[PDB]
Write a structure and sequence with these properties.
Layout: E1 2-6, H1 10-18, H2 27-30, H3 32-40, H4 43-46, E2 52-54, H5 60-63, E3 92-93, E4 97-104, E5 110-118, E6 134-139, E7 148-154, E8 161-170, E9 175-184
Bound molecules: zinc ion (8 copies).
PDB class: oxidoreductase
Keywords: lpmo, AA10, CBM33, PMO, GH61, cellulose degradation, copper monooxygenase, oxidoreductase
Assembly: monomeric
């Protein structure tokens, strides 16, 4: 099990930035979206590698409703529902060409990755994510077992605040991870 670690996914980033200091009183002001997540269920961050669904059979729109993309369709008994909050999530700066890097403790492999980015004109700070507001930026073939996977993404004409949505179809069974990463193209 794993996540997108660079550009950090929403829950991985909240964990990386605040996990050693998760009750820091400055968090509400400095990173309100992480604060609300930690207040909803701290296990969304402690279990940063558990954002998956089993059995989707490749039909992701059937099991991930609009407005629930970042929780993987309110997966895992609602643990990650706070990741669907709309607001000024902390971004990672990326260039037009950037690498999506996943860490996987188990070396499951991938049948494929799908990578999307929110369209120009979509404002993640004030609008819920929907499938219709995504544009596909890459689809890959299979990756063999490894503790890390890298997807070299190339985009042009994307500026400012976006969300990257990475879908990892693992190879050990029908299991899929749904990772939102807030990014800033500048
Ligand atoms: Zn695993
Ligand atoms: Zn990093
Ligand atoms: Zn402030
Ligand atoms: Zn920046
Ligand atoms: Zn370029
Ligand atoms: Zn790693
Ligand atoms: Zn590890
Ligand atoms: Zn910016």
């Amino acid at each position: 099990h794993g996540s997108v670690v660079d550009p950090a996914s929403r829950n991985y980033g909240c964990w990386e930035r605040w996990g050693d200091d998760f009750q820091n009183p400055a968090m509400a002001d400095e990173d309100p979206m992480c604060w609300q997540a930690w207040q909803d269920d701290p296990n969304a961050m402690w279990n940063w590698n558990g954002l998956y669904r089993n059995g989707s059979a490749g039909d992701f729109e059937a099991v991930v409703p609009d407005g629930q993309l970042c929780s993987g369709g309110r997966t895992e008994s609602g643990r990650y529902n706070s990741l669907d909050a709309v607001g000024p999530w902390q971004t990672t700066d990326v260039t037009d060409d950037f690498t999506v890097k996943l860490h996987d403790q188990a070396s499951h492999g991938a049948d494929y990755f799908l990578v999307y980015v929110t369209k120009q004109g979509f404002d993640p700070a004030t609008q819920a994510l929907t499938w219709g507001e995504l544009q596909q930026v890459a689809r890959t073939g299979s990756y063999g077992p490894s503790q890390n996977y890298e997807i070299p993404v190339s985009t042009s004409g994307l500026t400012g605040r976006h969300v990257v949505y990475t879908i990892w179809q693992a190879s050990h069974m029908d299991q899929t991870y749904f990772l939102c990463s807030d990014v800033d193209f500048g």
